[PDB]
Subunit: 136 residues, 4 copies
Amino acid sequence: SMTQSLREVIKAMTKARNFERVLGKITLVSAAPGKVICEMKVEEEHTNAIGTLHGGLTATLVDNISTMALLCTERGAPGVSVDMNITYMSPAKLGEDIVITAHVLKQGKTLAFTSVDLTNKATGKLIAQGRHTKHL
Amino acid sequence: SMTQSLREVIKAMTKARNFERVLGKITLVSAAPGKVICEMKVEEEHTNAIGTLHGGLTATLVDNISTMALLCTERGAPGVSVDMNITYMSPAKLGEDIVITAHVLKQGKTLAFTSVDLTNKATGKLIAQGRHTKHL
Amino acid sequence: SMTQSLREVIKAMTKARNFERVLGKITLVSAAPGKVICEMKVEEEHTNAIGTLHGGLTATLVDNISTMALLCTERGAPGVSVDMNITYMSPAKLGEDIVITAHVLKQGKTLAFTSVDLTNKATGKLIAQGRHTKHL
Amino acid sequence: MTQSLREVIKAMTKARNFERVLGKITLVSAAPGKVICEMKVEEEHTNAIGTLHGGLTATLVDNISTMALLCTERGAPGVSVDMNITYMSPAKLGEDIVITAHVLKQGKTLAFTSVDLTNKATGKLIAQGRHTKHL
C-alpha cells in the first residue's frame, strides 16, 4: 500500500522532465514507517569525468530518498531542505550495484532529520553517508 | 589557458552523456587563480517537484564549479570529493538567473578546501552555500 | 587491555591542564574494535547559559570519543580533525545521564571516518549526532 | 553594542558552566550581524599534540556565532540545529587567532551563520564553520 504509493512516485520520475528525471533508474526495495531502501545500478548517465558515481548524484539520491523516508512517516510531510552533509568514503564504479537506505532520525513540529547510507550491494561496504535536515 | 580550458569543459557538458550533462546550461563568467564564476538560468529541467531549483542540482553545481576553481591553481588537480556540506537559505525560482561563485580556501599536499556561493544575479542575495573538502 | 588502556587515557583527563580536562567526568562503558561507548552525567560545568548540555561540549565529546574508537583499531592511529558536522535534535538537561557511542565507519591510508551518537540513557532518545573525518 | 557585548564576555571569565572555557577571548568589534573576537592560544586551549583543540574551535564557532545573532535587529540567540566545521591548519601554542562571525541570513524561524578562525599575524585560515540556529 504505502510501498505501492512510493513505487508509483518512482515510476513517475522516469518520464518527468524536471531534475527528478535523474533518478529514473532507481528501484524500490522496501518502504516502512520512516525507512526507505532503494537500489540502483551505476550507468554512464550516473558517472563523473573519471567514470565513477558523481558526487552530485549521490547528493541527489540523499535528498530525494530522504524525503521518501519522510513521506512514509505518520505526518507524511516532505519538507524543504535546510542543510545537507555528505561524506564520500569509497567510489562506486560503473556497473556497480548500490543500495540506498534512508532513516528518519527524528522529526518535530518544524524540523525533520534523516540519514542516508549508500552501500556496495555486493560487499555491504559504505560508499557514502548523508545527513539531511528538512524544514516541515 | 585557464579561461579557455574551462571554456572547453563547459562546451563538453553540453553534449556529454555522463551526469555532467545536467550542467550544460551553465555559462562561464570568469576564471582566475583559485576562483571561478559561472551563471545559469533556472529552467524546468533544473527544478524540483515544487518548481524551484533542485537541491541535488545545487549540490552538483557546487561539486563541479568547486572542482573548476581547483583546476585554476598551479597544481591544477581536480581531486576526489571527501566531504560536502550545503546550506539552503532561499529558493531559486524558475526563470531566475543565478550566479555560482567558487573559490579555493586552502589546498595542501593531499587536501584542498573550497567554498561555493549560489546567488540571485538580480538581488545578489544568497541562495545556498556549500563547502567542499577534496582529496588530492 | 583495550579497555584498561582507555580507562587510563580517561583517568589522565581528570588531571589534564589542556582542553581535554573538560571531559574528566566521562566514564568508559565498553571498548571494541571500531566502537567505544562512554557515559556522562550533565553537571553545571557541562552546560550553556540556559542550563542544557553546551553544543561545544557535545562537539568536544564527538571529537575525543571518536578518537578513542579509532584507537581501538588495527592501525590504532588517532588522526587529526579535517571535518566535523553535528546535528542537534533534542536537549540534554542538567542531571541527565547521556550515552556517547562512537563507530569507526571506514578508514583508509590517510582518511578515517567516524560517527558518534549522543542519546538519553534512560529513554534512549537521540540527543545529537556527529560525523567526523580525520587525516592520518 | 560593543561595550554591551563586552560585558557578556566578562561573565564567562567568572561563570562555572561551560562558557568559562571562553574566558580568555577578547572583543575587538561588534556591528549588526558581525562580531570579531581574538584569543591567544594557551595550554588550556590545546589538544594532546599541543595545538588548538578542535572542540574548543567548535565552542568558539557556536558562541561567537551566537554573538553575531545577538547583534541583529531581532537580537534573538536561537538554539543550534546544525553546525559544520572544516579544519584547514593548526593553531599553535602561543599563536594569536581572530574569530570572525557573519550572519548570512535569518528568517522567521531559522538563522544561518559563518565563522572564520584565522591567524592574526598571517591571516591564514585555521578553520571555518557554518552554523544553523532555530529561532
